[PDB]
Design a protein around this ligand. Sequence first.
Ligand code: ZN
Length: 187
Amino acid sequence: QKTYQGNYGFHLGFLQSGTAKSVMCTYSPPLNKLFCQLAKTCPVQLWVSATPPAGSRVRAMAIYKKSQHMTEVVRRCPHHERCSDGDGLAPPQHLIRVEGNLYPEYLEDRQTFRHSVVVPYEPPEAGSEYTTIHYKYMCNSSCMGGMNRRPILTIITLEDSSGNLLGRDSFEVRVCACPGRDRRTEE
Ligand SMILES: [Zn+2]
């Protein structure tokens, strides 16, 4: 999926991490791919060159990477959907959750039925140049009945208060037991 920096120069950034066996979350620049453990927090940085209009919003959605699976809604496997790990906010079917935000909106498209989670866009804290949002993935890439070993992309869209696109970026995700090991192999 093509990026769209748009008028506000929107794009994502990730902390630099290694490939030690015990790392719980690690991003690969060369693959533009995040590797992470099940339900562990992933800080994703939002960068802009100009401040978006007030009331702008940030949406995250998962899609299958491969063309033959791309029309299938990404969702949790039935086992994980029933395992009672809710936070009181996220519906149990949603793969992507946000943490550390008081205003998340868990949404289902009325025509495509795809899931997403939206939070307000906030400018970077004092003496910072990015904004951070903490995402977690609630299923393994290997979940039978769910992603079933199929790679996904996370699409992050910056939207205005009317829901019009302002900017888009994306990254591949692999949710796995040993992110350190798998990044190095895939690399
Ligand atoms: Zn699962």
